[PDB]
Motif scaffolding. Structure first.
Motif, PDB file in Angstrom:
ATOM      1  N   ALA A 214       0.857  -1.177   0.000  1.00 48.07           N
ATOM      2  CA  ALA A 214       0.000   0.000   0.000  1.00 48.07           C
ATOM      3  C   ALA A 214       0.895   1.228   0.000  1.00 48.07           C
ATOM      4  O   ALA A 214       1.848   1.299   0.786  1.00 48.07           O
ATOM      5  CB  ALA A 214      -0.927   0.015   1.219  1.00 48.07           C
ATOM      6  N   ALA A 215       0.603   2.184  -0.876  1.00 53.42           N
ATOM      7  CA  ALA A 215       1.463   3.353  -1.043  1.00 53.42           C
ATOM      8  C   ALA A 215       0.635   4.631  -1.039  1.00 53.42           C
ATOM      9  O   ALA A 215      -0.410   4.699  -1.690  1.00 53.42           O
ATOM     10  CB  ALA A 215       2.256   3.263  -2.352  1.00 53.42           C
ATOM     11  N   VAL A 216       1.136   5.666  -0.366  1.00 55.16           N
ATOM     12  CA  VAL A 216       0.477   6.965  -0.322  1.00 55.16           C
ATOM     13  C   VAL A 216       1.111   7.838  -1.391  1.00 55.16           C
ATOM     14  O   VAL A 216       2.343   7.902  -1.493  1.00 55.16           O
ATOM     15  CB  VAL A 216       0.619   7.624   1.064  1.00 55.16           C
ATOM     16  CG1 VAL A 216      -0.003   9.037   1.070  1.00 55.16           C
ATOM     17  CG2 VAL A 216       0.041   6.732   2.161  1.00 55.16           C
TER      18      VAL A 216
ATOM     19  N   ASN B  91       2.485  -7.678  -6.461  1.00 53.02           N
ATOM     20  CA  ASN B  91       3.579  -8.167  -7.292  1.00 53.02           C
ATOM     21  C   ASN B  91       4.041  -7.098  -8.278  1.00 53.02           C
ATOM     22  O   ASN B  91       4.321  -7.374  -9.445  1.00 53.02           O
ATOM     23  CB  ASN B  91       3.181  -9.460  -8.002  1.00 53.02           C
ATOM     24  CG  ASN B  91       2.671 -10.504  -7.035  1.00 53.02           C
ATOM     25  OD1 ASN B  91       1.551 -10.999  -7.158  1.00 53.02           O
ATOM     26  ND2 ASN B  91       3.477 -10.795  -6.019  1.00 53.02           N
ATOM     27  N   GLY B  92       4.114  -5.857  -7.794  1.00 52.74           N
ATOM     28  CA  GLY B  92       4.595  -4.739  -8.576  1.00 52.74           C
ATOM     29  C   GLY B  92       3.625  -4.189  -9.593  1.00 52.74           C
ATOM     30  O   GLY B  92       4.020  -3.323 -10.385  1.00 52.74           O
ATOM     31  N   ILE B  93       2.367  -4.625  -9.574  1.00 53.66           N
ATOM     32  CA  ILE B  93       1.347  -4.200 -10.533  1.00 53.66           C
ATOM     33  C   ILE B  93       0.259  -3.430  -9.802  1.00 53.66           C
ATOM     34  O   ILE B  93      -0.273  -3.906  -8.795  1.00 53.66           O
ATOM     35  CB  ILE B  93       0.735  -5.393 -11.291  1.00 53.66           C
ATOM     36  CG1 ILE B  93       1.798  -6.107 -12.119  1.00 53.66           C
ATOM     37  CG2 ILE B  93      -0.396  -4.910 -12.204  1.00 53.66           C
ATOM     38  CD1 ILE B  93       2.348  -5.221 -13.184  1.00 53.66           C
ATOM     39  N   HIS B  94      -0.095  -2.260 -10.330  1.00 49.94           N
ATOM     40  CA  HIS B  94      -1.130  -1.454  -9.701  1.00 49.94           C
ATOM     41  C   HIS B  94      -2.454  -2.206  -9.682  1.00 49.94           C
ATOM     42  O   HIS B  94      -2.903  -2.735 -10.704  1.00 49.94           O
ATOM     43  CB  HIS B  94      -1.291  -0.127 -10.439  1.00 49.94           C
ATOM     44  CG  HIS B  94      -2.350   0.749  -9.852  1.00 49.94           C
ATOM     45  ND1 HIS B  94      -3.616   0.844 -10.390  1.00 49.94           N
ATOM     46  CD2 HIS B  94      -2.349   1.534  -8.749  1.00 49.94           C
ATOM     47  CE1 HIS B  94      -4.340   1.671  -9.657  1.00 49.94           C
ATOM     48  NE2 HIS B  94      -3.594   2.105  -8.656  1.00 49.94           N
ATOM     49  N   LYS B  95      -3.069  -2.272  -8.505  1.00 47.24           N
ATOM     50  CA  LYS B  95      -4.345  -2.959  -8.316  1.00 47.24           C
ATOM     51  C   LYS B  95      -5.514  -1.986  -8.213  1.00 47.24           C
ATOM     52  O   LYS B  95      -6.522  -2.142  -8.903  1.00 47.24           O
ATOM     53  CB  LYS B  95      -4.264  -3.825  -7.053  1.00 47.24           C
ATOM     54  CG  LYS B  95      -5.514  -4.596  -6.704  1.00 47.24           C
ATOM     55  CD  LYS B  95      -5.264  -5.497  -5.502  1.00 47.24           C
ATOM     56  CE  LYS B  95      -6.389  -6.468  -5.324  1.00 47.24           C
ATOM     57  NZ  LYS B  95      -6.114  -7.452  -4.250  1.00 47.24           N
ATOM     58  N   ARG B  96      -5.398  -0.969  -7.369  1.00 47.48           N
ATOM     59  CA  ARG B  96      -6.525  -0.081  -7.119  1.00 47.48           C
ATOM     60  C   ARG B  96      -6.019   1.172  -6.421  1.00 47.48           C
ATOM     61  O   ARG B  96      -4.884   1.225  -5.943  1.00 47.48           O
ATOM     62  CB  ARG B  96      -7.600  -0.775  -6.275  1.00 47.48           C
ATOM     63  CG  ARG B  96      -7.046  -1.373  -4.971  1.00 47.48           C
ATOM     64  CD  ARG B  96      -8.138  -1.732  -3.972  1.00 47.48           C
ATOM     65  NE  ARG B  96      -9.027  -2.800  -4.406  1.00 47.48           N
ATOM     66  CZ  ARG B  96      -9.038  -4.033  -3.903  1.00 47.48           C
ATOM     67  NH1 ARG B  96      -8.189  -4.386  -2.941  1.00 47.48           N
ATOM     68  NH2 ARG B  96      -9.907  -4.914  -4.361  1.00 47.48           N
ATOM     69  N   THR B  97      -6.884   2.183  -6.367  1.00 50.31           N
ATOM     70  CA  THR B  97      -6.556   3.460  -5.746  1.00 50.31           C
ATOM     71  C   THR B  97      -7.774   3.940  -4.974  1.00 50.31           C
ATOM     72  O   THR B  97      -8.903   3.850  -5.469  1.00 50.31           O
ATOM     73  CB  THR B  97      -6.135   4.500  -6.784  1.00 50.31           C
ATOM     74  OG1 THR B  97      -5.024   3.997  -7.534  1.00 50.31           O
ATOM     75  CG2 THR B  97      -5.723   5.789  -6.100  1.00 50.31           C
ATOM     76  N   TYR B  98      -7.548   4.446  -3.766  1.00 49.02           N
ATOM     77  CA  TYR B  98      -8.657   4.892  -2.935  1.00 49.02           C
ATOM     78  C   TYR B  98      -8.148   5.872  -1.887  1.00 49.02           C
ATOM     79  O   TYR B  98      -6.946   6.103  -1.758  1.00 49.02           O
ATOM     80  CB  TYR B  98      -9.343   3.692  -2.280  1.00 49.02           C
ATOM     81  CG  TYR B  98      -8.408   2.733  -1.550  1.00 49.02           C
ATOM     82  CD1 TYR B  98      -8.089   2.920  -0.209  1.00 49.02           C
ATOM     83  CD2 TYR B  98      -7.853   1.629  -2.200  1.00 49.02           C
ATOM     84  CE1 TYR B  98      -7.244   2.035   0.467  1.00 49.02           C
ATOM     85  CE2 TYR B  98      -7.001   0.755  -1.532  1.00 49.02           C
ATOM     86  CZ  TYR B  98      -6.704   0.965  -0.197  1.00 49.02           C
ATOM     87  OH  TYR B  98      -5.882   0.085   0.479  1.00 49.02           O
ATOM     88  N   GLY B  99      -9.088   6.427  -1.117  1.00 43.84           N
ATOM     89  CA  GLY B  99      -8.767   7.321  -0.025  1.00 43.84           C
ATOM     90  C   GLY B  99      -8.545   8.737  -0.502  1.00 43.84           C
ATOM     91  O   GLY B  99      -8.609   9.057  -1.688  1.00 43.84           O
ATOM     92  N   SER B 100      -8.337   9.618   0.469  1.00 47.24           N
ATOM     93  CA  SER B 100      -8.044  11.014   0.187  1.00 47.24           C
ATOM     94  C   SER B 100      -7.403  11.589   1.439  1.00 47.24           C
ATOM     95  O   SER B 100      -7.582  11.057   2.537  1.00 47.24           O
ATOM     96  CB  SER B 100      -9.302  11.797  -0.185  1.00 47.24           C
ATOM     97  OG  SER B 100     -10.173  11.858   0.931  1.00 47.24           O
TER      98      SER B 100
ATOM     99  N   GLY C  77     -10.004  -1.883  -0.300  1.00 48.53           N
ATOM    100  CA  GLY C  77     -10.248  -0.594  -0.913  1.00 48.53           C
ATOM    101  C   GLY C  77     -11.541   0.091  -0.503  1.00 48.53           C
ATOM    102  O   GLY C  77     -11.835   1.175  -1.025  1.00 48.53           O
ATOM    103  N   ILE C  78     -12.303  -0.492   0.425  1.00 49.04           N
ATOM    104  CA  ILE C  78     -13.571   0.060   0.898  1.00 49.04           C
ATOM    105  C   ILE C  78     -13.367   0.678   2.276  1.00 49.04           C
ATOM    106  O   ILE C  78     -12.873   0.007   3.190  1.00 49.04           O
ATOM    107  CB  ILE C  78     -14.654  -1.031   0.988  1.00 49.04           C
ATOM    108  CG1 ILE C  78     -14.823  -1.773  -0.339  1.00 49.04           C
ATOM    109  CG2 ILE C  78     -15.973  -0.458   1.580  1.00 49.04           C
ATOM    110  CD1 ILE C  78     -15.485  -3.138  -0.191  1.00 49.04           C
TER     111      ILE C  78
END
Length: 94
Positions: A39-41, A52-61, A88-89
């Motif tokens: 998980a990365a900000v 595994n180094g592949i973008h899965k999803r994006t969320y938050g603010s 992601g929820i």
């Protein structure tokens, strides 16, 4: 898996046993992993999940830091709260 994530000029560098494995992501300011997901900000205050180094999803603010614990992602915000996400929820705030 016991992996260490290092953020270097906005990119995520993965290490295992001191050996570089891969590099991915951009404009990252903080990251954490449980060995399964990273998980990365972002500098824009979002949380990006990689697998595994592949973008899965994006969320938050308003995110400024992140911690992966027992299948949840705990996001610290610029408002001083912890927002807990699962898959992601948004689940709860504390």
């Amino acid at each position: 898996m016991a992996i260490v994530v290092k953020v270097v000029n906005g990119k995520i560098q993965e290490f295992e046993n001191g050996i570089h494995k891969r590099t991915y992501g951009s404009n990252i300011v903080a990251a954490d992993t449980d060995g399964h997901i990273v998980a990365a900000v972002t500098a824009k205050g979002k949380v990006e999940e990689f697998e595994n180094g592949i973008h899965k999803r994006t969320y938050g603010s308003n995110a400024i830091n992140v911690q992966v614990s027992g299948g949840v992602v705990a996001v610290t915000t610029s408002k001083g709260k912890v927002e807990e996400y699962k898959n992601g929820i948004h689940k709860r705030t504390y």
